[PDB]
Amino acid sequence: KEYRTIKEVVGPLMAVEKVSGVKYEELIEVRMQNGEIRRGQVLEVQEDKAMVQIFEGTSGINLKNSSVRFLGHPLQLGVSEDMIGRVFDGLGRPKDNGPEILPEKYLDINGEVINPIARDYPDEFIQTGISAIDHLNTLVRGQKLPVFGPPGAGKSALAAQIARQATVLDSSDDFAVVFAAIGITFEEAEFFMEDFRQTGAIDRSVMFMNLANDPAIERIATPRMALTAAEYLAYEKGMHVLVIMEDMTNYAEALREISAARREVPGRRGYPGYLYTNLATLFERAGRIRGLKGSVTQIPILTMPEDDKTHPIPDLTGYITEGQIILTRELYKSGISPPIDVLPSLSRLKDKGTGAGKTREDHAATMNQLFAAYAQGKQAKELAVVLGESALSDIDKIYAKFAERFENEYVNQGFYTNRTITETLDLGWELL
Amino acid sequence: IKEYRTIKEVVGPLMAVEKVSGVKYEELIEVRMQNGEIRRGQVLEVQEDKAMVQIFEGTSGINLKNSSVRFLGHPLQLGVSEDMIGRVFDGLGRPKDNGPEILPEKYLDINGEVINPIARDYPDEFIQTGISAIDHLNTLVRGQKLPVFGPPGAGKSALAAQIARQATVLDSSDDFAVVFAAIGITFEEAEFFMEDFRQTGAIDRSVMFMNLANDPAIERIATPRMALTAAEYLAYEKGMHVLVIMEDMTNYAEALREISAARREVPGRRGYPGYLYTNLATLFERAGRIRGLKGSVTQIPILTMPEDDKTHPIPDLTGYITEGQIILTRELYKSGISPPIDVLPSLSRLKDKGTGAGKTREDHAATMNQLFAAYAQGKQAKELAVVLGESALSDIDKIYAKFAERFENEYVNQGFYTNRTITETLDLGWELLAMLPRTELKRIK
Amino acid sequence: MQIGKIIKVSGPLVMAENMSEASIQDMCLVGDLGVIGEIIEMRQDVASIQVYEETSGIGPGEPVRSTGEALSVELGPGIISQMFDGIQRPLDTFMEVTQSNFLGRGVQLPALDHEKQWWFEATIEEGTEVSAGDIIGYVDETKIIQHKIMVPNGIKGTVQKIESGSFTIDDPICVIETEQGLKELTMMQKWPVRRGRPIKQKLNPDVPMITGQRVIDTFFPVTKGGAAAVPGPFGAGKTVVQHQIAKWSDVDLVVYVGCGERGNEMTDVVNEFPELIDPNTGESLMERTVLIANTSNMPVAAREASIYTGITIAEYFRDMGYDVAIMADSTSRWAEALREMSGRLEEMPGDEGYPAYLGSRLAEYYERSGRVIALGSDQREGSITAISAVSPSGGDISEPVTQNTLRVVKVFWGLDSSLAQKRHFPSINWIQSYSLYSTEVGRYMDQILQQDWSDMVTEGMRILQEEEQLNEIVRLVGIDSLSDNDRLTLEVAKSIREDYLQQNAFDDVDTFTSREKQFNMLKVILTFGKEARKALSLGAYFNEIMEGTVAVRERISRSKYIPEEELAKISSINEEIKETIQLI
Numbered sequence A: 001k002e003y004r005t006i007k008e009v010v011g012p013l014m015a016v017e018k019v020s021g022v023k024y025e026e027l028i029e030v031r032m033q034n035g036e037i038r039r040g041q042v043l044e045v046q047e048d049k050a051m052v053q054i055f056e057g058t059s060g061i062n063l064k065n066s067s068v069r070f071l072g073h074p075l076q077l078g079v080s081e082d083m084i085g086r087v088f089d090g091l092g093r094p095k096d097n098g099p100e101i102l103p104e105k106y107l108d109i110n111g112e113v114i115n116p117i118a119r120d121y122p123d124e125f126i127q128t129g130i131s132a133i134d135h136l137n138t139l140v141r142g143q144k145l146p147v148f149g150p151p152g153a154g155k156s157a158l159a160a161q162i163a164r165q166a167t168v169l170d171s172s173d174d175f176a177v178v179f180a181a182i183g184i185t186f187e188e189a190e191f192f193m194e195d196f197r198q199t200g201a202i203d204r205s206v207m208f209m210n211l212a213n214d215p216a217i218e219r220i221a222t223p224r225m226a227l228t229a230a231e232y233l234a235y236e237k238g239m240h241v242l243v244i245m246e247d248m249t250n251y252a253e254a255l256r257e258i259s260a261a262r263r264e265v266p267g268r269r270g271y272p273g274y275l276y277t278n279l280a281t282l283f284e285r286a287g288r289i290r291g292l293k294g295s296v297t298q299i300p301i302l303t304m305p306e307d308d309k310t311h312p313i314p315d316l317t318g319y320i321t322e323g324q325i326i327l328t329r330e331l332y333k334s335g336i337s338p339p340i341d342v343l344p345s346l347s348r349l350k351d352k353g354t355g356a357g358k359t360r361e362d363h364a365a366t367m368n369q370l371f372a373a374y375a376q377g378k379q380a381k382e383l384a385v386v387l388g389e390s391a392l393s394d395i396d397k398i399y400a401k402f403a404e405r406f407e408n409e410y411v412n413q414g415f416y417t418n419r420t421i422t423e424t425l426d427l428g429w430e431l432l
Numbered sequence B: 001i002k003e004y005r006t007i008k009e010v011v012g013p014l015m016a017v018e019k020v021s022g023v024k025y026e027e028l029i030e031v032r033m034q035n036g037e038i039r040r041g042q043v044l045e046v047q048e049d050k051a052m053v054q055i056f057e058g059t060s061g062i063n064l065k066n067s068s069v070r071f072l073g074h075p076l077q078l079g080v081s082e083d084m085i086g087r088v089f090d091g092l093g094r095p096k097d098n099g100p101e102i103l104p105e106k107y108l109d110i111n112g113e114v115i116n117p118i119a120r121d122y123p124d125e126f127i128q129t130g131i132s133a134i135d136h137l138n139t140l141v142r143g144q145k146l147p148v149f150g151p152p153g154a155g156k157s158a159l160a161a162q163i164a165r166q167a168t169v170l171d172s173s174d175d176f177a178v179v180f181a182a183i184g185i186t187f188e189e190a191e192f193f194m195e196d197f198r199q200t201g202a203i204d205r206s207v208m209f210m211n212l213a214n215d216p217a218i219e220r221i222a223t224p225r226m227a228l229t230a231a232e233y234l235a236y237e238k239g240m241h242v243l244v245i246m247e248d249m250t251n252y253a254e255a256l257r258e259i260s261a262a263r264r265e266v267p268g269r270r271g272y273p274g275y276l277y278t279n280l281a282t283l284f285e286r287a288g289r290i291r292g293l294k295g296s297v298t299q300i301p302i303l304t305m306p307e308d309d310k311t312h313p314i315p316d317l318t319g320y321i322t323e324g325q326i327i328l329t330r331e332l333y334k335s336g337i338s339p340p341i342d343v344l345p346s347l348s349r350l351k352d353k354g355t356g357a358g359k360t361r362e363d364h365a366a367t368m369n370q371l372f373a374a375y376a377q378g379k380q381a382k383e384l385a386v387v388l389g390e391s392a393l394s395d396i397d398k399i400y401a402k403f404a405e406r407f408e409n410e411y412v413n414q415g416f417y418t419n420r421t422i423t424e425t426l427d428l429g430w431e432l433l434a435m436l437p438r439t440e441l442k443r444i445k
Numbered sequence C: 001m002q003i004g005k006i007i008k009v010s011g012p013l014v015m016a017e018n019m020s021e022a023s024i025q026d027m028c029l030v031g032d033l034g035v036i037g038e039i040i041e042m043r044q045d046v047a048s049i050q051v052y053e054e055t056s057g058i059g060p061g062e063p064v065r066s067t068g069e070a071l072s073v074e075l076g077p078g079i080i081s082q083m084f085d086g087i088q089r090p091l092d093t094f095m096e097v098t099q100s101n102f103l104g105r106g107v108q109l110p111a112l113d114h115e116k117q118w119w120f121e122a123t124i125e126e127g128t129e130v131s132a133g134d135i136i137g138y139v140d141e142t143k144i145i146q147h148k149i150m151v152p153n154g155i156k157g158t159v160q161k162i163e164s165g166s167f168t169i170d171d172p173i174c175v176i177e178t179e180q181g182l183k184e185l186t187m188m189q190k191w192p193v194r195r196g197r198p199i200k201q202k203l204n205p206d207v208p209m210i211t212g213q214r215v216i217d218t219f220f221p222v223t224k225g226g227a228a229a230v231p232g233p234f235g236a237g238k239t240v241v242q243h244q245i246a247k248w249s250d251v252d253l254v255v256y257v258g259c260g261e262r263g264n265e266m267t268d269v270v271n272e273f274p275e276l277i278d279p280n281t282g283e284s285l286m287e288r289t290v291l292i293a294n295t296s297n298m299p300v301a302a303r304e305a306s307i308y309t310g311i312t313i314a315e316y317f318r319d320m321g322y323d324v325a326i327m328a329d330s331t332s333r334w335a336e337a338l339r340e341m342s343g344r345l346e347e348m349p350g351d352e353g354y355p356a357y358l359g360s361r362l363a364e365y366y367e368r369s370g371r372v373i374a375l376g377s378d379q380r381e382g383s384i385t386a387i388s389a390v391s392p393s394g395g396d397i398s399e400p401v402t403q404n405t406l407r408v409v410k411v412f413w414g415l416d417s418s419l420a421q422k423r424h425f426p427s428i429n430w431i432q433s434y435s436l437y438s439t440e441v442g443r444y445m446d447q448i449l450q451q452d453w454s455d456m457v458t459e460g461m462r463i464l465q466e467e468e469q470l471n472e473i474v475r476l477v478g479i480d481s482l483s484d485n486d487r488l489t490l491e492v493a494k495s496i497r498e499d500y501l502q503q504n505a506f507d508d509v510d511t512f513t514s515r516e517k518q519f520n521m522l523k524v525i526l527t528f529g530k531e532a533r534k535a536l537s538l539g540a541y542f543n544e545i546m547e548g549t550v551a552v553r554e555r556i557s558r559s560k561y562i563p564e565e566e567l568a569k570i571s572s573i574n575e576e577i578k579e580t581i582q583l584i
């Protein structure tokens, strides 16, 4: 309590002395000479000294007169049922200046590992209302499904549409949406806020906002916070949660930043090296547990470098995350909204989520025949790539009407259009 | 005056001195060797009573116990006097011309100081190089920073000598000088330069410093700083229009790579140090004109794009730093034209300040725009014809393509020892430009 | 106060003992000469110090003195129309005080003319409740910019006595009974550079900036409060792009930061800006322009200090209600400074040697810019438009600087060496250069112009994109393998880039091209193309369809500074209609 033995300040780090009972990854708060107060977290503890990182920074600290207090608990998020309708910062602190929230209980944000046998497989699909997602790589409750896109491809716009139109057919209780904004600009953040207010989803949603201005170490916590709140709603309160996290790329950038700040030797391709485990720890907090009502679904939005050479490796996560959804600007150029390249997108859990009793079962057969129509329809128009002098010009025009029609209509249904699955099926029938 | 006899370590070319005080960073030192030889070094890092120095010549043969170090009290200084002209120096301000030592008027830190931006006067007037492409298309201005980029080959070196002898201000000015710095050149490279200077009678007009490959690497760093200090001094104290020419700055920054490697500095791009840009800048931004003074320093650094002309860190950083470029292409070198100058890549940003009526003839600016366009389109037609015959050329592209051939064949290749005045370049350009139909050009006679 | 003794000097790193009372990131006078420096890390009682001046000749044993304050800029009357050092030292006073034409070490210069007398007219009334940002009176620093004096932060209370009169920057002009004690304030306030000035609310930028430059305003527009990047190789026109938009932008104030760049450029600006005048009010551009010079020779730590100082001044004039446009010349120079500082500290290297926090530093900068609601009762709206120039590697832009830059900005003007090579001096590359504001700008433009202009810009860009395909097709035959419409479409794209796209060659008339003229120019071009095509369909053949008026290209140059554009530009429309039908 209120130790006053700061012996070093280097960069954003500090060294404290004559402290005992200090655990690793333990939150501290610093009392400066000017009465300012800052939060930091223990990152290394020796026999008597300990070493911490300050979130806000070390500018303005006088070591002789500053003081440190060890809280005695790691990073926590207070959980309450009153979260809905609310906006929080990176560390789950109110950002809308609303009523004070009394936490039901304070939860460690790292979470726990579901026992493999305990986990329950996902068998029921979720109607996105997007023909280019529902029919084919369909999304099931509890699935880990990510959308890959480049900046300015409308990836954020698609994410908004999914949030607005997400629902399930049983609908005994309504859906719940947890949205995390990770290291994104104000303009980007504002887009989502405006959509939710306008559409009224704020009353039905909970969100955590972390902008680029905010410190990198708050980005790490931001995902953990959103998933911990999602788990609280999902399992303790039985809700059905859709978790949407926007640009885990910058979470990964922050991961590298923190690793360099902690003087950790880089891993593969200059990244920390525990990225595989860190991402998998995040992404695997999904699915349904047997014996519990609620469920957790994740649609992480990820900015994708055009090159495969560097950033948060698509296949580093892609095989972690049970399928993926691809957006491309080449697509986007010709009024194709939401630009979903359907060639390389898959939902790993599509087969089981698709059947009579959960879907109208034209759908599995019709999806497979339209999957053949994807391949053959591509053959018909997509594969030409300005070639096909003779190919598709020999009364394959059925083909050479199919796929261009499909690419325009089906992929660009309009960002504010909601297609009931049966309809999507029907427009597939029309295209048949 | 103190000699320190306590040397704790020697590591390659670096040594550390224990139990000393009053030292300062970047100070020079002198070592008394056990045999009595004297080596010059400079301090690199100081803390408490320990000093860290690096010997220019090397540490081979140094007994630590029986050897001592003197602290000179000053960093690298060049003594200056107005008798610099006519005497040839080496990279360390020492005499290489079998000449008597100069009575230095004063001693100057070679690093000098930054010219304050408001105090600086913008580049202007015109310097006559004798080069048709340089004087006409890519005009040179006093205080401008124009470099020469070439392939590894003969063109640069010949052009350096030619520029040095011919380049004179248009007669108006009272006096003129040239400062020649020579980096990483073989003995013969050096002797070619020196013999042309003695033979053309420009040695009396000019001061020059000679540094060779055999000389230590750190000396190459010192040499440009020396040359630019003396150039500054002449222009900003003795009111002369100094003109500085530097040889293969690649050799200079390869010295920087060698030095940094010895000091285990982290590499940058292509092994060159991180501070390449600013270091180059510290030299190149000492040119210009100061407000309230007459006389100016103009820099024409020379360099080869090493190996394949990829424009790799040496040329790219130089291009960022200078106010233009004149580049030589080996395709033109292979052909008869000498100097081989591809006009299109080459550029002088401040041309217009030094051109127009009064300073030059009134047509100087209008001619270059037309000749440039006609060249680009004659070459356009030239390559266009290739693998498509002359049918595509038709009438208009045919005359145009031949324009490009004629342009390179006589306008550009001056010959390496033949001077051109600005007026005869312009008039020649007119005769060359007369082949073209009077309807195409951009302005009236 | 306590004196610290230098114990180590390594490059720009200075370590000094007995500095217990100092705090982190405090400016300090280091050495005998007292060169300026900053404390970046403290271990026990010793402090590692980063200096902003050349330490050649500084040794151990010399004293070190702390100022006990972080890096800050003087914010008061006198700022406008002045050129500053990266640490806000005014260069003109510097020259006179030192009686030298060079930059020496250890100079102590107040940033603002404290001695000059200003006429302050008070607007607040005694008894008024005040808060941070509330404006009490205004000094007419220029005939254009009224220097609005407002209550600093951390001060709330009731005014006691305030009266108009002649005061200097130091004389107290007003006093407030605050919560505890009495606070008297001057017309000047200090502000820490690194931390952004607080605001009440941030807003979306949806007001296009009139660059004057045709390609920018028509195709890749930047809104008031947005951010733009200019990546380009050397010899491309990025420096002069910042110059043009600094000259002609419809923005109340302009802040120019030239870190790590040539000094002639800054000298040129201060000579030509007073010579340039603006007829809207009859006074020079320097009355509204501010300058901060940190050349390549000037020390590298000042290169970061320069961009931060620049934006702190911009945020100051933004809290007054004005719009500001700040442009940093070659932010790479800033990043390259930060890289060697990371290497000398032996930090864990990030990408390409840059520190790991590069993307964070960059993000903090651009997000300080924007259209915001300033602090105070009136809740006035101010904006900062951020222009960043980036010079990287060779032509290759895929390096941490531009990539992190484009992650946080919505406007990309990409210059390529080939376009500048062909003396397409406005070398903004089309089809890559993109403005994410373009769709919002279209709505604004249509409402302001009361005409369908958005469809015009989509048609223009679609024609250009079409031409890219026709270049690959043209390899077979130059003009006999394509189609008739394709040949005409080529001629239209040629006209777009050779007339609309190409901008000034330092020509007065070809430099600005008002928005009204931009409309008429693009309309005459577009009408010609579509008339010629649709009229070509009816048995009109291209062999002589290209005929008569090619002077349209030439025509766009003239009639700018005077309103002679309406007649001259629409007469081209009617004339081309007549001639199209006559050709039949």
Ligand SMILES: Nc1ncnc2c1ncn2[C@@H]1O[C@H](COP(=O)(O)OP(=O)(O)NP(=O)(O)O)[C@@H](O)[C@H]1O
Binding pocket: B319, B320, B321, B347, B348, B349, C232, C233, C234, C235, C236, C237, C238, C239, C240, C241, C261, C330, C391, C425, C426, C427, C503, C504, C505, C506
């Ligand atoms: N309208 C124009 N737009 C762009 N460049 C132009 C224009 N008119 C002329 N230029 C040329 O542009 C060059 C100056 O461009 P500039 O931006 O200063 O180079 P730069 O890329 O900034 N070099 P640096 O900033 O040091 O990396 C000169 O050669 C001018 O001739």
Ligand SMILES: [Mg+2]
Binding pocket: C238, C239, C261, C262
């Ligand atoms: Mg520039």
